[PDB]
UniProtKB/Swiss-Prot annotation:
It is found in: Nucleus, Nucleolus. Component of the core factor (CF) complex, which consists of RRN6, RRN7 and RRN11. The CF heterotrimer may further dimerize to form a hexamer. RRN11 interacts with RRN6, RRN7 and SPT15. Present with 476 molecules/cell in log phase SD medium. Acts as a component of the core factor (CF) complex which is essential for the initiation of rDNA transcription by RNA polymerase I. After binding of UAF (upstream activation factor) to an upstream element of the promoter, CF is recruited in a SPT15/TBP-dependent manner to form a preinitiation complex. The chain holds residues 1 to 254 of 507 of the full protein. This is RNA polymerase I-specific transcription initiation factor RRN11. It comes from Saccharomyces cerevisiae (strain ATCC 204508 / S288c) (Baker's yeast). Signal peptide: none annotated. Transmembrane segments: none annotated. Disulfide bonds: none annotated.
Amino acid sequence: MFEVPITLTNRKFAQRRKLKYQYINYISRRFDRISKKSSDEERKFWKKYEKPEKSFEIWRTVSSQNKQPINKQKMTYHNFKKIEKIPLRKMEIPLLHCTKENKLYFQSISRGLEPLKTSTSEVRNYRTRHIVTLTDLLHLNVSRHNWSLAYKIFATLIRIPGVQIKSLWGIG
DNA sequence: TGGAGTACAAGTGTGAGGAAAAGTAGTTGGGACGAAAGCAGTTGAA
């Protein structure tokens, strides 16, 4: 349930985000050439946005000049399936080089259908399996205001290698 | 009182997946104790 302090990575997750952010670069360019009639591939993505670094989300005052008139002309299904088609053409040949469940992912996440499999569950590393165990027992006693026990879990969690700042300072 | 079609399992090739700790990929930090004198051949113009 609770967040874990692991620097966990797998090839199926390194691909499935890269399989996603490779695609998004093409469909972003395609949206602006139809707006013109009217290469890490993820390092290239975040150059469109400013990472907030103070808050989670870049919140912004509103009663100011950051306002806009509402755009009138809206989407339809006929324009959406023709603006995605040419990015869906070029994507299909790297879709057969990637693994089929990464390929099952991008087929599923492009029609809606967010993933229901959370990444810290199938990792099965036996050391992360205790790091997932301890942090769900760490928060559970802090939830239950049991402090001599949640001390003991927290003293044991910081000694297991690979744990982060996340557990460290927050519940001081 | 033999044959026509046919799902359940015994049984056989193709690649595709899984993982880690080593190495390498771009930004930023950082490296470079001296304001002395009367005097003389040349040399100023008268």
